[PDB]
């Protein structure tokens, strides 16, 4: 009849709150750590580059740029070499055009080389062609020439005064002289045996000459034969002589006086070609100075002039630089226009000089810009840097985050304990109270 | 009736590290209209120090010298006895010592004197009683004299 049971529970209830106390500590540690690490990272997250970019942004992108710049420099030096290869050819053309300028100068001015004012050779004196095969042939002639003129019918021989023309406009006097060129002199002895001997005894000043010898005499057939008419100058009736037939005894091949022979630009074209009848041959010159003897049959012949004063070109008035006027005053204009057509290419080479100079200067400036850039690149690669803080702060964030994860890993099972422990412990509370 | 008694037993909650003064609030606890009340009548002075003496047996007013003949309530001694955790007190004049000690200090023969006060007492623990008087002493002593270690060391090491 006693009251038996005593209190038994006050002690066990503690374990519940004892373990529950960790609910505060775990979450407090997690919150403190994560909030503090986030606050500290708030700085670094944007302060990694407070000063790093200002000077640091060059080195990397310019190190990527060097691959362009170095090869572009090589390319521009190579195209500068090609530019020099063009300029050297330009100055090759320069020396060439110098060659052509001297060439054209000489070609146009070689009218000076022999006939500038050569008209004044004798200068008020007197001279003759009577001994002209060498400058010393006069010893052959001077006072022994008289022993020739006795083998002849009316005198034939030197033709000295016979080759002089009376007045007459200058231009036409080429054809008859060209014709007589075949028989320029006609000394002779009738004997056929002395052919060599007489010419050989005529060697009183050597045999360095080309003396011609002719046996032919006056021809005989009348002057009333088919004479032409005067519309353009003819120089057959222009000579004084001992006998008229002197100027006719070669007519067999010098057929000039009995034809309607004309020139190229007048009297209907190409009647020279048209095989004239009742006459033998009438071929005529093409051009006044060098043009050949036009023909429509037997072929042409040249008239490239060759002659000299040989008696006196000036016999009434004697001086120069007045009458023969046009040639030099037009050769000056030829010099002028040749200079023009060469100075156009001189301006071309000047323009090419401007082009190459501008290209070279532009390339020099472009390359010097890149030289400064690559100097600064290769240089600032070795810049001052503060990488230490970046790594330190990143590591501080990382290790702290790992610690936070470790903290979080511990809460769940420790929290799980409490529910089952309380289920075990609590229900006796009502039990002892009911037992009371 | 009856159950009105227990109530104030929770008094032992007086244990408080942050105590600054208990002189007044301990008074009215005795109001009522037990051994716990008896020990309450004397224990409050322990907060000052547990090793003091103010004997009701000679005079509760004032002390005579600083010698006790019965000890300063020591806790350990390397040449006399290992630390104290379970003392048992006498019923006559406060003779007290460890429970587990005398069982071998008097192994076989009981009537022997007690070397504690230079006086004759030749009876042993079989007539002793449970000791509720010791509870406060070591508990307050350690709580008071261990908390000074942290502050000085912390302030000496925090210089930099």
């Amino acid at each position: 009849e006693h009251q038996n049971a005593r209190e038994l529970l006050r002690d066990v209830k503690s374990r519940f709150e004892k373990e529950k106390s960790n609910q505060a500590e775990a979450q407090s540690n997690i919150d403190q750590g994560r909030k503090k690490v986030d606050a500290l990272n708030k700085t670094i997250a944007h302060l990694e580059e407070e000063l790093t970019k200002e000077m640091g942004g060059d080195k990397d992108q310019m190190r990527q740029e060097l691959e362009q710049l170095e090869k572009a420099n090589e390319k521009l030096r190579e195209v500068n070499n090609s530019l020099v290869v063009s300029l050297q050819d330009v100055k090759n053309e320069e020396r060439d055009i110098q060659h052509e300028r001297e060439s054209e100068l000489r070609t146009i001015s070689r009218s000076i080389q022999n006939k500038k004012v050569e008209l004044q050779n004798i200068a008020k004196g007197n001279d003759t062609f009577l001994m002209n095969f060498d400058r010393n042939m006069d010893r052959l002639l001077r006072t022994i020439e008289q022993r020739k003129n006795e083998f002849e019918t009316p005198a034939i021989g030197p033709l000295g005064s016979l080759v002089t023309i009376r007045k007459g406009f200058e231009k036409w006097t080429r054809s008859i002289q060209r014709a007589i060129s075949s028989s320029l002199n006609a000394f002779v002895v009738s004997n056929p045996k002395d052919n060599r001997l007489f010419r050989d005894i005529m060697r009183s000043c050597g045999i360095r000459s080309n003396i011609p010898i002719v046996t032919y005499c006056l021809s005989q057939f009348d002057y009333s034969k088919g004479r032409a008419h005067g519309n353009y100058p003819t120089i057959v009736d222009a000579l004084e002589f001992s006998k008229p037939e002197i100027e006719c005894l070669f007519v067999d091949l010098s057929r000039i006086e009995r034809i309607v022979l004309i020139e190229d630009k007048n009297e209907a074209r190409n009647f020279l070609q048209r095989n004239p009848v009742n006459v033998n041959m009438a071929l005529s010159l093409r051009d006044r100075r060098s043009g050949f003897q036009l023909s429509g049959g037997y072929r042409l012949d040249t008239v490239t002039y060759q002659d000299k004063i040989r008696l006196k070109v000036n016999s009434s008035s004697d001086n120069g630089t007045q009458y023969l006027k046009d040639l030099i005053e037009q050769e000056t204009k030829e010099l002028q226009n040749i200079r023009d057509r060469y100075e156009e290419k001189l301006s071309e080479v000047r323009s090419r000089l401007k082009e190459i100079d501008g290209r070279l200067k532009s390339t020099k400036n472009e390359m010097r810009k890149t030289n400064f850039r690559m100097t600064e690149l290769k240089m600032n690669v070795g810049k001052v840097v503060d990488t230490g803080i970046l790594n330190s702060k990143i590591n501080e964030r990382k290790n702290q985050e790992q610690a936070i994860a470790s903290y979080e890993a511990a809460k769940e099972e420790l929290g799980l304990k409490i529910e089952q422990i309380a289920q075990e412990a609590q229900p006796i509370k009502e039990q002892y109270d009911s037992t009371k | 009736y009856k159950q009105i008694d227990e109530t104030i037993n929770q008094l032992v909650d007086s244990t408080s590290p942050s105590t600054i003064g208990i002189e007044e609030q301990v008074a009215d606890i005795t109001s009522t209209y037990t051994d716990t009340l008896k020990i309450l009548k004397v224990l409050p002075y322990i907060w000052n120090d547990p090793t003091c003496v103010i004997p009701d047996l000679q005079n509760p007013a004032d002390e005579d010298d600083l010698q006790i003949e019965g000890g300063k309530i020591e806790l350990t001694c390397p040449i006399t006895c290992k630390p104290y955790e379970a003392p048992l007190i006498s019923r006559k004049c406060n003779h007290v010592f460890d429970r587990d000690g005398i069982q071998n200090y008097l192994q076989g023969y009981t009537t022997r004197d007690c070397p504690q006060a230079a006086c004759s007492q030749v009876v042993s623990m079989r007539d002793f009683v449970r000791d509720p008087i010791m509870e406060l002493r070591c508990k307050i002593a350690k709580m008071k004299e261990s908390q000074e270690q942290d502050k000085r060391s912390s302030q000496a090491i925090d210089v930099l």
């Binding site: 060098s290 072929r299 290769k378 | -």
Partner: protein, 428 residues
């Protein structure tokens, strides 16, 4: 009435009091943190021990290395300023080699007779007229070339001997064998330049007097000693002159001695088309309107060089041209060799630039080493952030724990006063 609730408070203390240890335990965490961090700061001082301030010349070693890089650039530009001169020199050298080429061609001119025609002024027109025809094939039914180059006369005196065979005008004219082809040939050129042509109708080649014959004593093989050339040109030599009938005994003779031929021969009307004996040449024409007398007329001649394969000779030739040719060749080639040695100097300048690049590499290595040791200095400096992180953290943690102790313990101790509420409605 009723029996009242009695205490029912009892355990209310526990749920507040027991929280006292909550950060009294954290005190140990505080102490562990301070001790560990103080040891860390001692390690930071150990790091302080190795001062080695960055190298003494940073602020001016930077200027130095700047100077070396600008020296690299300067040397490169200086060397290229002369590689341009090398380009000029090599271009002039190749032009000089071209000059050497055409000079050698002019020198080693082959057996061809083209060169002789250069003696006269306007005959370069004929030269070009033949040159463009030679260069391009076209089609020539009867190919025809100036006869001067297409004959093999024996010697210069014999060249004179046959020079008056045809006139200078003829020598600058192109013969034709198919008389029908008057102008068919001239499609490209027509009449641009100064040349003419010669016709052909007949020719003859028979051995005259090849036996005991019209005279008493024999002598010599007849006048065909050696004259050969183009088929058309030789047909012309026959048609226009008939040289194959002149009675040439190389020694002395006179027309009176020739008069045994006065009577008719395969040669018809009295006398020949032409006579030549040594340096003496004769002309024949009919005296139709004279005394009907037979008349030969003689002319003397001198040396001629055309119609023979030896254009000029080593004795005179166009010779000083060869001397100047080789002379300018030698000067230009030796100038090119001097330029090549200057280019060897330029290659040594390239070597100097490579040595400058070695200097650049060494200086960059030194600067990179110094910058990595500056990174070590930055490592040393990070302890400042370390200690600043420690200082506020430790103090704030200790403040928080101490204030929690203060407040919570005071709150619990004051709640202990609830005890007074228990001395209550039981009696008085």
């Amino acid at each position: 009435e009723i029996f009242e609730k009695l205490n029912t408070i009892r355990d209310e203390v526990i749920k507040k009091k027991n929280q006292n240890e909550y950060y009294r335990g954290r005190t140990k965490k505080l102490q562990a943190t301070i001790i560990s961090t103080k040891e860390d700061f001692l390690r930071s001082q150990e790091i302080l021990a190795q001062t080695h301030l960055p190298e003494k010349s940073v602020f001016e070693d930077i200027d130095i290395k700047r100077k070396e890089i600008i020296n690299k650039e300067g040397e490169i530009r200086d060397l290229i300023s002369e590689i341009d001169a090398k380009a000029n020199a090599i271009n002039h050298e190749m032009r000089s080699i071209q000059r050497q080429a055409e000079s050698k061609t002019k020198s080693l001119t082959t057996t061809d007779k083209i060169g002789i025609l250069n003696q006269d002024q306007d005959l370069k027109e004929v030269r070009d007229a033949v040159l463009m025809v030679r260069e391009h094939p076209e089609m020539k039914d009867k190919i025809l070339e100036p006869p001067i180059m297409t004959v093999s006369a024996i010697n210069a005196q014999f060249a004179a001997y046959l020079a008056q065979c045809v006139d200078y005008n003829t020598s600058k004219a192109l013969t034709v064998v198919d008389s029908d082809s008057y102008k068919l040939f001239a499609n490209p050129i027509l009449d641009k330049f100064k040349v003419n042509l010669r016709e052909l109708s007949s020719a003859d080649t028979t051995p005259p007097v090849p036996a005991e014959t019209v005279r008493d004593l024999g002598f010599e093989g007849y006048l065909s000693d050696f004259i050969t050339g183009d088929k058309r040109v030789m047909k012309m030599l026959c048609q226009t002159s008939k040289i194959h009938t002149i009675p040439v005994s190389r020694r002395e003779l006179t027309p009176a001695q020739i008069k045994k031929l006065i009577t008719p021969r395969p040669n018809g009307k009295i006398l020949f088309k032409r006579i030549i004996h040594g340096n003496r040449l004769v002309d024949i024409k009919q005296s139709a309107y004279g005394s009907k007398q037979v008349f030969p007329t003689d002319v003397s001649i001198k040396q001629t060089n055309f119609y023979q394969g030896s254009i000029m000779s080593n004795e005179q030739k166009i010779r000083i041209e060869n001397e100047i040719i080789n002379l300018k060749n030698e000067y230009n080639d030796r100038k090119s060799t001097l330029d090549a040695l200057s280019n060897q100097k330029s290659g040594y300048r390239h070597e100097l630039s490579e040595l400058a690049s070695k200097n650049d590499d060494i200086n960059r290595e030194a600067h990179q080493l110094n910058e990595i040791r500056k990174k070590y200095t930055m490592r040393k400096s990070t302890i400042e952030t370390l200690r600043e992180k420690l200082d506020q953290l430790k103090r704030e943690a200790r403040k928080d724990v101490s204030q929690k102790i203060k407040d919570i313990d005071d709150q619990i101790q004051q709640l202990l006063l609830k005890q007074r509420h228990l001395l209550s409605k039981m009696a008085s």
